[PDB]
Amino acid sequence: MDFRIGQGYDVHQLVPGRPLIIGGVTIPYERGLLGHSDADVLLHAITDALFGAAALGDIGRHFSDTDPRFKGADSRALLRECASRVAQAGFAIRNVDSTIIAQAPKLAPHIDAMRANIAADLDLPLDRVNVKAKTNEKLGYLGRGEGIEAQAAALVVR
Amino acid sequence: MDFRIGQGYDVHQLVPGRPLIIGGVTIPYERGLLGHSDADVLLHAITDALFGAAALGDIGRHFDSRALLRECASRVAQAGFAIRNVDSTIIAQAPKLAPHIDAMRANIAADLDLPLDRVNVKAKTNEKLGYLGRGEGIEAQAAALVVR
Amino acid sequence: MDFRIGQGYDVHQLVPGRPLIIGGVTIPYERGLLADVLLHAITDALFGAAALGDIGRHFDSRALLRECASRVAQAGFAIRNVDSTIIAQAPKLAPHIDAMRANIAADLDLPLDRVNVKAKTNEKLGYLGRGEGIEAQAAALVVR
Numbered sequence: 324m325d326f327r328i329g330q331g332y333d334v335h336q337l338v339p340g341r342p343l344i345i346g347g348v349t350i351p352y353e354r355g356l357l358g359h360s361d362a363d364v365l366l367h368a369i370t371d372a373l374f375g376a377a378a379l380g381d382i383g384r385h386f387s388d389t390d391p392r393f394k395g396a397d398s399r400a401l402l403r404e405c406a407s408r409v410a411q412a413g414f415a416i417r418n419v420d421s422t423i424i425a426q427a428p429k430l431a432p433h434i435d436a437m438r439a440n441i442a443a444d445l446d447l448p449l450d451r452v453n454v455k456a457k458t459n460e461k462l463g464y465l466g467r468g469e470g471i472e473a474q475a476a477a478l479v480v481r
Numbered sequence: 482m483d484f485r486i487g488q489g490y491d492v493h494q495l496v497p498g499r500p501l502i503i504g505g506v507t508i509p510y511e512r513g514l515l516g517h518s519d520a521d522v523l524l525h526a527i528t529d530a531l532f533g534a535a536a537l538g539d540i541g542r543h544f545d546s547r548a549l550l551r552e553c554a555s556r557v558a559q560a561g562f563a564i565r566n567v568d569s570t571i572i573a574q575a576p577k578l579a580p581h582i583d584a585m586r587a588n589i590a591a592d593l594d595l596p597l598d599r600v601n602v603k604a605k606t607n608e609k610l611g612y613l614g615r616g617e618g619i620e621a622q623a624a625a626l627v628v629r
Numbered sequence: 630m631d632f633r634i635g636q637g638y639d640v641h642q643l644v645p646g647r648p649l650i651i652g653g654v655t656i657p658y659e660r661g662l663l664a665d666v667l668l669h670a671i672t673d674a675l676f677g678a679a680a681l682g683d684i685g686r687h688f689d690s691r692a693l694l695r696e697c698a699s700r701v702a703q704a705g706f707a708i709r710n711v712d713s714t715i716i717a718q719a720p721k722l723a724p725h726i727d728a729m730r731a732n733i734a735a736d737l738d739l740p741l742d743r744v745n746v747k748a749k750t751n752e753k754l755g756y757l758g759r760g761e762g763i764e765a766q767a768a769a770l771v772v773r
């Protein structure tokens with residue numbers, strides 16, 4: 324009954340010449356997310372929520388964003404390693420919820436694939452993983468398509 | 482002991498000619514929230530947090546925002562979950578929301594068949610920053626705890 | 630087994646001529662907040678988990694956090710954990726995280742391993758990315 328909650332946030336700029344990878348899904352699009360890694364904003368937010376629930380710091384503490392070994396890093400591999408460290412700390416994952424905010428492209432066709440990827444990486448059934456997709460109702464830099472944001476919440480138990 | 486958490490986010494533009502309805506409360510104001518529904522940003526954020534905790538997707542996949550919140554609660558129950566508590570924040574530079582918070586909590590508690598002491602609504606400004614600080618929209622955030 | 634969750638949000642403008650205090654820590658930097666954004670978010674998350682309203686209805690931001698914790702306890706709740714994120718484009722916050730965690734854990738009378746603080750930039754986007762403000766987000770779990 325030693326439950327703990329974590330929360331996560333990430334944002335990346337949307338720029339030409341990059342793959343668009345969200346929730347482990349390579350989405351065909353003229354632009355992609357800019358980062359040292361593959362810039363998977365959704366997986367990073369979930370990773371942060373998991374480290375946070377376990378009181379293990381944050382994604383930047385665990386994976387160096389200047390190490391050449393993480394250039395173009397597969398963020399699913401990072402999420403699996405996060406889950407491994409959370410387990411080593413003594414915690415079991417109970418559920419993850421998340422939101423992606425993007426003006427474009429349409430994300431609804433890809434949500435089920437993202438959910439399946441996250442569930443596989445966390446060794447969870449599909450019914451403990453949720454991904455919600457939103458626009459920002461045309462407001463701000465999100466409404467202008469300059470970046471994509473993700474939010475996440477995770478419940479774990481020791 | 483099968484607890485789950487959900488989180489929700491919503492934002493809508495403030496435009497002339499619409500009533501301002503937040504948490505089911507009609508607030509006197511020169512503008513109101515723009516949307517296909519009544520654009521109740523707080524009820525939508527709570528609805529998304531409840532769908533998220535139950536792993537039932539989101540408000541866009543599933544659909545007056547109180548009727549929608551009641552239907553969301555029905556679908557959460559249909560999945561086998563009981564709602565334990567909801568917490569939330571509204572971010573608006575104007576108008577003042579404190580006089581309306583208790584009516585909002587009462588509306589949410591009635592719609593979710595919860596006691597008042599399991600529902601919470603918090604009010605914030607954005608310190609004059611961004612589109613929220615310029616009064617161009619209102620944001621809501623929500624967290625929900627459920628149990629199977 | 631009567632668990633409850635709360636969530637908190639705060640933001641303040643960042644301009645020259647003020648000290649930068651986050652999580653009770655004075656951080657060397659050319660600008661400061663116009664205002665402890667992290668402690669307020671945590672305070673709001675705790676009031677929210679207890680269904681006691683918000684920081685504006687109830688009230689140094691450390692003294693406020695300690696009083697918030699006292700009211701949460703008198704309402705019958707024990708705090709189980711806090712997690713949080715600070716979004717600031719500059720300065721680097723990683724060197725101060727342990728000091729922030731120590732201050733929060735002390736104020737909440739929690740073991741250190743139940744308090745977490747995460748740090749992010751906003752990738753140069755928006756008022757946060759331009760260094761015009763700093764945001765904090767928080768989540769708290771309590772039990773009656």
Ligand SMILES: N[C@@H](Cc1c[nH]c2ccccc12)C(=O)NO
Nearest residue numbers: 358359360362383386387388393
């Ligand atoms: N959002 C941050 C999270 C992060 C920090 N250090 C890392 C190292 C590898 C991958 C991601 C990270 C980022 O750098 N994405 O590319």
Ligand SMILES: [Zn+2]
Nearest residue numbers: 333362364367
């Ligand atoms: Zn990232």
Ligand SMILES: [Zn+2]
Nearest residue numbers: 491520522525
């Ligand atoms: Zn809405």
Ligand SMILES: [Zn+2]
Nearest residue numbers: 639665666669
């Ligand atoms: Zn504040």
